[PDB]
Every structure is written in C-alpha cells, then in structure tokens.
Amino acid sequence: SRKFFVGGNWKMNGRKQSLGELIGTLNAAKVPADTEVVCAPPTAYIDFARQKLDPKIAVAAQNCYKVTNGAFTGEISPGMIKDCGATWVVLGHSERRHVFGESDELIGQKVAHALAEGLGVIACIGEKLDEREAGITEKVVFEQTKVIADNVKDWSKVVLAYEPVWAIGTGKTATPQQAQEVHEKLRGWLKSNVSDAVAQSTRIIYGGSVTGATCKELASQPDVDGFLVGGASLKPEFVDIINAKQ
Amino acid sequence: RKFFVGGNWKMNGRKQSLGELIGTLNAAKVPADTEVVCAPPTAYIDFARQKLDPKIAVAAQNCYKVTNGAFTGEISPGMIKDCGATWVVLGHSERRHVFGESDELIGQKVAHALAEGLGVIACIGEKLDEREAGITEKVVFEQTKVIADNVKDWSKVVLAYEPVWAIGTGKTATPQQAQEVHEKLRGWLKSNVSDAVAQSTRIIYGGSVTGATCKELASQPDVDGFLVGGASLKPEFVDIINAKQ
C-alpha cells in the first residue's frame, strides 16, 4: 500500500531539441507497473514536454504562485499548469527556499492553492549543513513539514521529498541509513501530528544523491518510497533509477 | 525613435482566453512607425509565439543570469530564444518589490540577456515613500546606472519607467509628472552615456495606461511608448498601439 515514486527534476536545463532527445529515451524505456514516474521540465517547456511525453509519465511544474491570476510578472498559476496538461507541481524546493528566499509561509500558501486547484504537490523539505551540524535536523524538517501539513486537507495528492541540503554541493555525503533515519522520523511526525492513515499512505521520497549503483539500496530502505532526482534525471541512468525496485 | 508598445499580460490567461486575444491582435493593422511586443506568462511563451503573427514580437516576463543550471523554477535567455521570443522584461516592479530582486541581480540578468542576443525591456521606478522623501531622481538614476553598467549596445534596450508610487497608494501620476521623470532619465543618458544613446533610446511609460489616457501620454515629448498592464489583455490594447496615429 505505497506506490514507488520517481520524480525527475530537470531544473533549468535543456532546449527543445535536447529535451526532445531526452523525452525520446524516456518514451522507449519501459516503465514498471509499480512505479509512478513524473518529469519536471523548465517552465518554458511544460507544454512542449507534455505534448512529446508518453502519458505513462506525468508532467510537473518546478514552481507556481498562490493565486489563480494576478499582477505577478514572472509567475505562473496552478490553473496555467493544468491548462498545459501537467498534473503536478514541485513546491518548497531547496533552491527556491535558499537561492530565491521563499518562506515557509509562502510555500504553505502555494500548497493550499495548488491542491485546491486539483494539482498534485511534491512538497520539498530539508536541513542545511549548519543546521545539521548544530544538531537541529529534526526541528527544521518538522517545522517545514508542519507548515506544509497546515495547508493540506487531502494527502492523497501530496508527496514529501526530503532534500539532504547538508550533503549537496558541500563535499559531504549521505549514507542510506542516514536517509532512512530522517525518512522514519518524518513518517513518525505524520503519525503523531496528522494520522496513522496519512503516515502509512504518504510517499516520502529521497532528494539527495542517487546513482544507478546506490539506487537499489536506497529504494529498499523501508521508509524510502522513491526519488526526486536532479542532475541524473537528464541522463540515461534515470531509467535505472525508475527500475530501482526491479 | 520608433514608437514602442509592450503588452505585459502578467500572471493572466489560459490557452482559450489568450487564443482569442491573439486572434484580436493578429487582425490589427500595426502602424509602420510602431513596434509591438507581448509578454505572456512563462508557461505560454511557446504557445503565444506560434499563434501570434510575426509582426508582433514576444517577450519573457523574467529570466535568470546563466545559460543552464541548478535553478529550479527559472528560465534562461537561451530558452527564451529557443521558443522564438526576442525580448525579456527585467527589473519589473513586481520582481523588485514582491519577489525581492535586487539591483545587483537585475543588472547581472541584463548583462547575460544581452550577451545572449535578447532585447531587454529594463524597468525602473520609485515607491511612494521615496518620492515623498524627495529622492525620485536618486532612486531612478541609481537603478538606471546599474542597468547602463551592464549595457554595451543600447540598440537592444528599451527603458521602462514605472511610477510604483502610483500603484494602489491613493496617488496617481499625470502625463506632466510622467514627462518630468522621462526628460530627467534621457538627460541622465545624455550626460552619462552619449547624446546619440539619449536621442535613440526609447523611454516608455510603465504606469496606468488605457484607451482613454494613451494619446496625451504619447504626445509628451520624452514618452516613446508604453509597457501596458491590464489594458494589454483587451481589445483596447489596439487603441494604445494606435496612439501616434
């Protein structure tokens, strides 16, 4: 009773021709029954990607705003995302939080509006190195999860992605037992603060480093339900990561 | 100086509604002395470019400062070019004052956008507290300086003045007050770049413009066009395109 979830976050990479090639590789690749596959292209190519991608793979926006229409030059709404045939949005990504300064409050508002509009939400959380080494990993990720939880009225269309930001571009790495450790406490937070039904049914995916060689061990961790893949989502080894349960 | 009319659609529309607006614009006889540009939501750059007649150019509403990278939710000038858009709006009041984009970031975006071959619609202007404290000129000349520091070729740049102080504050700008700022901005270009750049650089008005008000604003001697807000989503945008006719 928890479907394996592999999301591919292309970030700000690619053009039509290069992403066409990427999409060609994904389409010919055989997706397992038990694996839910989601691709998040750059915002200019949500529409392009959805038209080229086989429908066995869902499309996600990388971000969105918190109202349906408005005076918000540079933003897109969940309504616009649905209109392009995309069914998900990535919210609270480490880069939005830490490069573009998006607050927990704002991320929460965005979650409420996305869910209300009928989109799925990949809600991202994670502690930085200085927070980890200060021994406050739990306080950070629980507070972040709390604000998301405060804006979720139905969890069936939510997926939680833990980003070990402390082990990203920093010369430090996360062992699979350290991934499992955090994932377990997050599911425990859901159990204690939301419900047992939500704790049991909610996918908690891992956003840290994953390769074709570490993906099987990571996937088999009991509280790891799949992946939000960065750089490797642009390469052929995304297919290995999709088949990490096989 | 060729008259410049930009329509900023902001975060509005879907394929249906924007399809019909695009039909309406496609039917419009654009005057030969007037350059027209539409800035759609980022999800619709590609869609709008395919539907829009080539007589109208397409602009992204924002971009980031590198070609490719780990910047979830951002797009680059390369992507904008790749979708067939030839402009980008940068430093819009909403980027500066709602999403916190600094002069440092905006200037860097301007340099990368221009290096990459896009035209830039570069947006400046002062809030009410700044205007009332008497520092209009300081604020807008400083914002213009950061832009100019990152400009080598002004042929690819349009300056947009946004009286942010007039936006839902209880104050509004008259065409005389618009002209005053524009004439000051052009003199800043004369003195700090060249007379040639001052003479040939379109300075466009980015405050409230409608079918009713565009003719008198257009006739101001230092006002070279508009970056249009809400009116750009409607047929009356065509009246604003016709401002100098």
Map out the domains of chain A with their CATH numbers. 1-246 (3.20.20.70)
CB contact under 8 A, B43 and A47: yes
Cβ-contact B215, B243 below 8 angstroms = yes
3-class state of residue A138 by DSSP: helix
Consecutive H or E run containing B45: helix B45-51
Cβ-contact B106, B91 below 8 angstroms = yes
The DSSP call for residue A207 is -
Resolution attained, angstroms: 2.0
Q: Where are the alpha helices (DSSP H) in A66-163?
A: 78-83, 94-98, 104-117, 129-133, 137-150
Q: Where are the alpha helices (DSSP H) in A29-103?
A: 46-52, 78-83, 94-98
Which chain A residue is nearest to residue B96, measuring alpha carbons? Answer: A73
C-alpha–C-alpha distance, residues B234 and B245, integer Å: 19
Cβ-contact A22, A42 below 8 angstroms = no
Smallest CA-to-CA distance from A16 within A62, A56, A64, A51 is with A51
Q: What pairs with residue A205 in β-bridges?
A: A161
CB contact under 8 A, A43 and B83: no
Smallest CA–CA distance, residue B194 to chain A, in Å, is 32
- State how far the alpha carbon of A225 is from the alpha carbons of A122, A154, B95, in Å: 13, 19, 37
Which chain A residue is nearest to residue B43, measuring alpha carbons? Answer: A44
Cβ-contact B19, B240 below 8 angstroms = no
Phi, psi for B32 (deg, rounded to 5)? -60, -25
Q: Which of B15, B64, B74 to mutate to test the interface with A (most CBs of A within 10 A)?
A: B74
The DSSP call for residue A100 is S
The DSSP call for residue A5 is E
C-alpha–C-alpha distance, residues B227 and B67, integer Å: 26
Cβ-contact A41, A59 below 8 angstroms = yes
C-alpha–C-alpha distance, residues B61 and A74, integer Å: 5
Cβ-contact B43, A43 below 8 angstroms = yes
Using DSSP bridges, classify how beta strands B3-8 and A226-229 pair: parallel, antiparallel or unpaired. Answer: unpaired
In the Cβ-directed half-sphere of A152, how many Cα atoms lie within 13 Å? 26
B133: number of Cβ within 10 Å: 12
Q: How many residues are present in chain B?
A: 245
Region of A85 please: left (phi>0), alpha (psi -120 to 50) or beta.
Answer: left
Cβ-contact B25, B47 below 8 angstroms = no
Q: How many residues are present in chain A?
A: 246
Smallest CA–CA distance, residue A4 to chain B, in Å, is 23
Q: Which of A45, A73, A80 sits opposite B92 (nearest CB)?
A: A73
Cβ-contact A190, A199 below 8 angstroms = yes
B88 alpha-carbon distance from chain centroid: 8
In the Cβ-directed half-sphere of A164, how many Cα atoms lie within 13 Å? 24
Determined by which method? X-ray
B186: number of Cβ within 10 Å: 19
Instruction: Spell out the residues 6+ positions from residue A175 whose beta carbon is closer than 8 angstroms to its own.
Output: none
Smallest CA–CA distance, residue B190 to chain A, in Å, is 30
Exposed, middle or buried: residue A153 (CB in 10 Å: 0-12, 13-18, 19+)?
A: exposed
Cβ-contact A122, A228 below 8 angstroms = yes
C-alpha–C-alpha distance, residues A114 and A81, integer Å: 10
Question: Which residues of B fall within a CB distance of 8 Å from A75?
Answer: 11, 41-42
CB contact under 8 A, B43 and A95: no
Cβ-contact B123, B144 below 8 angstroms = no
3-class state of residue B204 by DSSP: strand
Kindly state the greatest CA–CA separation across chain A. Answer: 48
Q: Is A113 a catalytic residue?
A: no
Consecutive H or E run containing B34: strand B34-39
Q: Directed axis angle between helix B136-149 and helix B103-115, to 10°?
A: 40
C-alpha–C-alpha distance, residues A206 and A164, integer Å: 8
Cβ-contact B161, B204 below 8 angstroms = yes
Residue given tokens 């992403």 in the structure block: A19
First CA to last CA distance, chain A: 17
CB contact under 8 A, B71 and A12: yes
Q: Which two tokens stand for residue A140?
A: 């950070």
Which CB contacts under 8 angstroms, 24+ apart, belong to A103-110?
A104/A143, A104/A144, A104/A147, A105/A147, A106/A66, A107/A147, A107/A148, A108/A147, A108/A148, A108/A150, A108/A151, A109/A66, A109/A151, A110/A64, A110/A65, A110/A66
B104 and chain A: CB distance < 8 Å anywhere?
no
3-class state of residue A38 by DSSP: strand
Cβ-contact A221, A183 below 8 angstroms = yes
A155: number of Cβ within 10 Å: 20
Smallest CA-to-CA distance from B120 within B91, B79, B161 is with B91
Exposed, middle or buried: residue B230 (CB in 10 Å: 0-12, 13-18, 19+)?
A: middle
Chains A–B, number of C-beta pairs less than 8 Å apart:
128
3-class state of residue A53 by DSSP: coil
C-alpha–C-alpha distance, residues A198 and B127, integer Å: 47
Smallest CA-to-CA distance from A226 within A199, A206, A197 is with A206
C-alpha–C-alpha distance, residues B124 and B120, integer Å: 13
Using DSSP bridges, classify how beta strands B87-90 and A226-229 pair: parallel, antiparallel or unpaired. Answer: unpaired
Q: What pairs with residue B69 in β-bridges?
A: A12
Q: Which two tokens stand for residue A80?
A: 């616009």
C-alpha–C-alpha distance, residues A78 and A84, integer Å: 10
Which chain B residue is nearest to residue A99, measuring alpha carbons? Answer: B71
3-state secondary structure B205-238: ECCCCCCCCHHHHHCCCCCCEEEECHHHHCCHHH
C-alpha–C-alpha distance, residues B80 and B73, integer Å: 14
3-class state of residue A233 by DSSP: helix
Consecutive H or E run containing A36: strand A35-40
The answer to whether the annotation marks B29 as part of a ligand binding site is: no
Q: Directed axis angle between helix A137-150 and helix A104-117, to 10°?
A: 40
A65 and chain B: CB distance < 8 Å anywhere?
yes
The DSSP call for residue B11 is B
DSSP assignment of B119-171, as one string? EEEEEE---HHHHHTT-HHHHHHHHHHHHHHT-S-GGGEEEEE--GGGSSSS-
Smallest CA-to-CA distance from A123 within A135, A136, A134, A113 is with A113
Counts for chain A of helices (H) and strands (E), in that order: 11, 8
Which chain A residue is nearest to residue B76, measuring alpha carbons? Answer: A12
Using DSSP bridges, classify how beta strands B57-60 and A4-9 pair: parallel, antiparallel or unpaired. Answer: unpaired
R_g of chain B computed on alpha carbons: 17
C-alpha–C-alpha distance, residues A200 and A185, integer Å: 13
